[PDB]
Every structure is written in C-alpha cells, then in structure tokens.
C-alpha cells in the first residue's frame, strides 16, 4: 500500500507502495494475543523461595511423650501448624518461558505491522540526519510532524546521533531494523520508519 | 505473592452479629452461638409462614360457628345450605366480618334456612 512520504520536516510530496504481502494481509487477533502473552512472560526472573519443613533451623527431637499427659500428639516443633514452622508447598524457583513455531511468529509480526497501516499510524521518512546530538532538535522535529504520545523510531544504519538524542525524552524509543518485535510496535501508537529500513524489513520476511 | 486477608473475615462475622440483636445473654455477643441461632430462626420462619395460613382459618370457622348457633343452626348445616342455595361464593373471612358487624349476617342465614327445606 502507498502511504505518502515526508522529509526531516518537508512535506516532500510523494508515496511508497509497500509490499502487500507484508502490509496488506488480514490480521489474526487470535495469534497476536498469544504472541503478546508469550513475549510478556520470559521477562520475569522468578527468583523466589520459602523454607521447607526440613530446611528450617530447628529440632528433630519430639517435645513430649505420646501418653500419660493430656495433650495433642506432636512431633517436631517445626511442623506446619506450629508458630515458626515450615511452609507446606509455597513459591519455588523455576522458569516461565516457552516457544512457538516459526510460521506463527511470522504471521504475528506481519499482522501487527499491517494492522498499523489501517489506522494511518505509519509515517515513512527519508535520510533522517542529525548534525549534532542535541535534545532540542529532536523535540522540534517531533513537534513538526504532529507527534504527541509515544512513538517508535526505526532506522537501519545504527545511528548514534539519533540514539543519543531522544533517549531522554520520556516517550520515544529508538531501535534498529532487526530489533522490531510485537510489544513495542503495539505499545507505541505512532510508528516512524525510514525507507532504507522499510526495504530491510520487507526483505527479511 | 502472599495474601494476608483480615478485613473480609471481620466484615463477614459482623454481619451475623448485627443480625442477632435482641437475643438473651451471650447469644447476641459471641459469633459461634449467634450463627447457630440465626440458622434455626430461618428454618422456623419458613415453617411458621406455612402454619399461619393453617391457623387463621380455624379462628374464622369458630366465629362463624358461634354466630350461626345464635340463630338456631350449626356450622355444617349452614355451610351446606349456603352452598346448596344460589351458590354464595363468599368465603369465611368476609363471613366473619359480616358476623362482627351483623344484621347482614342474619339475612344470609334465612336465605340458607329457606333452601334447607
């Protein structure tokens, strides 16, 4: 699909027809849902542990005899019912990640970045050169393109001026063309991208 | 994560305790006995809701019997005569109202006496 064309701040009338196979397919919500759930897990550590009944620093002898005196029969003073005993079951260290077949991943990324096109939430640029690494310049450029909320910025050449700037602005995020995944695309509203990165993205998949 | 949870227990018990106001002694103060009393009271209320319908008709019948005996009849003969004559579909409740405010009760009595022969 063709989607206009802009310059660092110039209207630069134009358009770039994008690979339909990549920017026109019908989205699968039932795939984006589990892609999101999988990606959100595997971000957690899972470093938690409780003391067992046998790990509590304590006693093995029994507090008193089983007959002669009227009292409930009791073994260790570190049983789950005593105050200061072990935790039955409870949190244990483990892993939370898992894997999906590759074609599902390809479908999910395609669907998300093709549904972005429907809502006119894609801006394609050219060049994107910064003379210096000032944060004022990036804010002026962003205002010049009517960007208010969060906004992803995708390049291809691993710019250092673009990465250094806009890394203090509390809404923007800069990534390489290879680093695109589902979460930041669906969590950033607007999506800036360079045509040079467009070619790489639509040539990998 | 760990879950503490105390306010839920306090609220759930205070509801029952507020429902058991007016009971004798410790039955309005301690949770365990108040709970049992509340459950028993529910059972009793159901049973007595049926029984009150059972017991109002008896009083109705007794008052009709007295008023009819004042006229020279019995309850059974009066009822047979009323059902036999002109199908008076008046129940017993309005019959008692007409008894306690009579001189209209008597007219129905002679209406039945006419057909009893």
């Amino acid at each position: 699909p063709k989607v206009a064309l802009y310059n660092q701040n110039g209207s630069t009338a134009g358009d770039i027809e994008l690979n339909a196979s990549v920017f026109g397919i019908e989205p699968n919500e039932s795939v984006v849902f589990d892609a999101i759930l999988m990606q959100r897990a595997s971000l957690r550590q899972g470093t938690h542990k409780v003391k067992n009944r046998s790990e509590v620093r304590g006693g093995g002898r029994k507090p008193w005899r089983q007959k002669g005196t009227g009292r409930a029969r009791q073994g260790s003073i570190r049983s789950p019912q005593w105050r200061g005993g072990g935790v039955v079951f409870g949190p244990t260290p483990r892993s939370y990640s898992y894997k999906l077949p590759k074609k599902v991943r390809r479908l999910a990324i395609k669907s998300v970045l093709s549904s972005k096109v429907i809502d006119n939430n894609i801006i394609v640029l050219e060049d994107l050169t910064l003379d210096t690494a000032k944060t004022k310049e990036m804010a002026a450029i962003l205002k010049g393109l009517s960007v208010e909320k969060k906004a992803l910025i995708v390049t291809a050449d691993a710019n250092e001026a673009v990465a250094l700037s806009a890394r203090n602005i509390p809404g923007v995020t800069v990534v390489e063309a290879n680093g695109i995944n589902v979460l930041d695309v669906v969590n950033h509203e607007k999506l800036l991208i360079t045509k040079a990165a467009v070619e790489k993205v639509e040539e990998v998949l | 994560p760990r879950v503490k949870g105390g306010t839920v227990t306090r609220k759930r018990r205070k509801k029952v305790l507020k429902l058991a106001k007016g009971y004798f002694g410790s039955k309005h103060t301690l949770y365990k006995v108040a709970n049992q009393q509340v459950m028993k009271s529910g059972n009793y209320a159901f049973r007595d809701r049926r029984q009150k319908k059972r017991d109002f008709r008896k009083l109705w019948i007794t008052r009709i019997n007295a008023a009819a005996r004042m006229n020279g009849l019995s309850y059974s003969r009066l009822m047979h005569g009323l059902k036999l004559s002109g199908i008076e579909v008046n129940r017993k409740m309005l019959a008692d109202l007409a008894v306690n405010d009579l001189t209209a009760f008597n007219q129905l009595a002679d209406a039945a006496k006419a057909q009893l022969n």
Binding site: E29, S30, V32, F33, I36, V186, N187 | -
Partner: protein, 146 residues
C-alpha cells in the same frame, strides 16, 4: 489490538478447579475422594499392575521369539508418490532424499507398487530388484537395481 481491549480466542482457556474450599461447590469436605479407596488413603494405594493378588495376565501368557541383530529396514516409496517427477528425468536415492519424499535413508530405498503410474523415467533403487516384482513391469523396465 490495544493492550486494554485484549480478548482471547473463544473456548481456549478454562479456569482451574480448586478443591476443598467450602461445601457449596461440591468437593467440599472430602475433596472428591469419598471415604477413600485405599489410594485416597494416605500413602498412595496399590501398584498399577497389582490386581489385589492373582497370577497376572502378563505373568501368565508365555513370551516367545528372539530379536535379530542384523535386521534391515528400507525406506518405502509407493508408485503413486513417484508420479510427480514428470517425463524423462532420473530417480536416485539422493534426489528423493533432498525433496521430502523420504525423510531418512536407513539401509536402502525399496519401491513397491500400490498405486498408479504414468510417464516414463529411470529408477535406481537399492531394493533387491527395484520393486516387489509388481512394480518392475509397472515401471516398464528402466529399473537400475543398484
């Protein structure tokens, strides 16, 4: 999607079944085990194959046969799946291998006929005679048996 308007596919998730939490749900006091069947009795119960004490069916029937060390299994290819290579062409185990017709090449390739055949090709299979003597003629010759 939007991260707040998130909804799963219908019928793919079920909620767990927590057991032993009150009497109004079923599984209330005894947790669905009744008054125990010796396995719901603390400890585990009985061994799976245990039949309460009886000469087991598995320990009764005799055990027969001996395994063979030099057992040779070939890769089976029927006539029908061979019918995708057009006319002419050469058929060799490697060519079948890097196409997906056969997934592995243990021992050798043994083509035996069960379906239909058209076109004319050349077949080079280990087998013993390139066919179970019913696809040799089906292949109308051209059967390199090596």
């Amino acid at each position: 999607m939007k991260l707040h308007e998130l909804k799963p596919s219908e019928g793919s998730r079920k909620t767990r079944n927590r057991v032993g939490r009150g009497i109004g749900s079923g599984n209330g006091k005894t947790a669905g085990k009744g008054h125990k069947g010796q396995n719901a009795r603390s400890g585990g119960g009985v061994r799976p194959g245990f039949e309460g004490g009886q000469m087991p069916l598995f320990q009764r029937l005799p055990k027969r046969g001996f395994t063979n060390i030099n057992r040779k299994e070939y890769a089976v290819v029927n006539l029908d799946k061979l019918n995708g290579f057009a006319e002419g062409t050469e058929v060799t185990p490697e060519l079948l291998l890097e196409t997906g017709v056969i997934s592995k090449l243990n021992a050798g390739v043994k083509i035996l006929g069960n379906g239909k055949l058209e076109k004319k090709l050349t077949v080079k299979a280990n087998k013993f005679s390139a066919s179970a003597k019913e696809a040799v003629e089906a292949a109308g010759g051209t059967a390199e048996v090596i």
